[PDB]
Amino acid sequence: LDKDAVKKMFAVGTASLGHVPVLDVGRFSSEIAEARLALFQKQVEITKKHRGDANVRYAWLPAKREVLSAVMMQGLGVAFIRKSIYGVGIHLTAADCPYFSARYCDVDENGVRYMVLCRVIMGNMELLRGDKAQFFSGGEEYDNGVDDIESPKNYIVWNINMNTHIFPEFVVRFKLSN
């Protein structure tokens, strides 16, 4: 996608919160990001061959200014791992639902918030049954987890998959009211 489409995705997806000014949309562009994209695209090939369909989706990851620098070289295991009602992994918000996690993006010293748009290899999606103690796939037939099959709001990528199945691509800088 281009930066305008990402901006539009974020604007339509946060409309319910009122005035949400988008200050900037950026894309990670470096030798490490390229190598990390190549790694991700090989996992896409593998998951496609294994399941028939890689089922790559866009999803939103709440971030903060302080972790952006680190994210490409050392991975998502900086600090992005959360425990929810659905289990433990990386929790991302579906493409049309950034309103859901916008407030969970930490404000920096200037009032600015940061949300990352990621490509996620969801593969064969497991409908999650609400197990607090789940930290991996409920079975060999499933890859990553989702809360609702028809209208997804939350994806759970298991810890084992965090570096293979998520490519952080775009950073959206924004503000909210009080």
Author numbering: 273 to 350, 353 to 452
Quote the paper:
Our crystal structure of the RCD1 PARP domain provides first insights into plant PARP domains, and we identified several molecular differences between RCD1's PARP domain and the catalytic domain of mammalian PARPs. The RCD1 PARP domain adopts a fold that is overall similar to mammalian PARP domains. Nonconservation of the His and Tyr residues critical for NAD+ binding in canonical ADP‐ribosyl‐transferases suggests that the RCD1 PARP domain does not bind NAD+ and therefore is likely to lack canonical PARP activity. Consistent with this inference, the RCD1 PARP domain is not stabilized by 6(5H)‐phenanthridinone, an inhibitor of mammalian PARPs (Wahlberg et al., 2012), at elevated temperatures. Conceivably, the cleft of RCD1 that corresponds to the catalytic center of active PARPs has evolved to bind other small compounds. To test whether this region of the protein is required for the biological function of RCD1, we designed three RCD1 mutant variants with single amino acid exchanges in the cleft region. Given that the N‐ and C‐terminal domains of RCD1 mediate protein–protein interactions, the PARP domain of RCD1 might act as a scaffold bridging and/or coordinating the action of the terminal protein interaction domains.
In addition to the central PARP domain, RCD1 and its paralogue SIMILAR TO RCD ONE1 (SRO1) have an N‐terminal WWE domain and a C‐terminal RST domain. RCD1 and sequence‐related proteins localize to the plant cell nucleus and bind several transcription factors via their RST domains, possibly explaining why loss of RCD1 function affects plant development and several stress signaling pathways (Katiyar‐Agarwal et al., 2006; Jaspers et al., 2009; You et al., 2014).
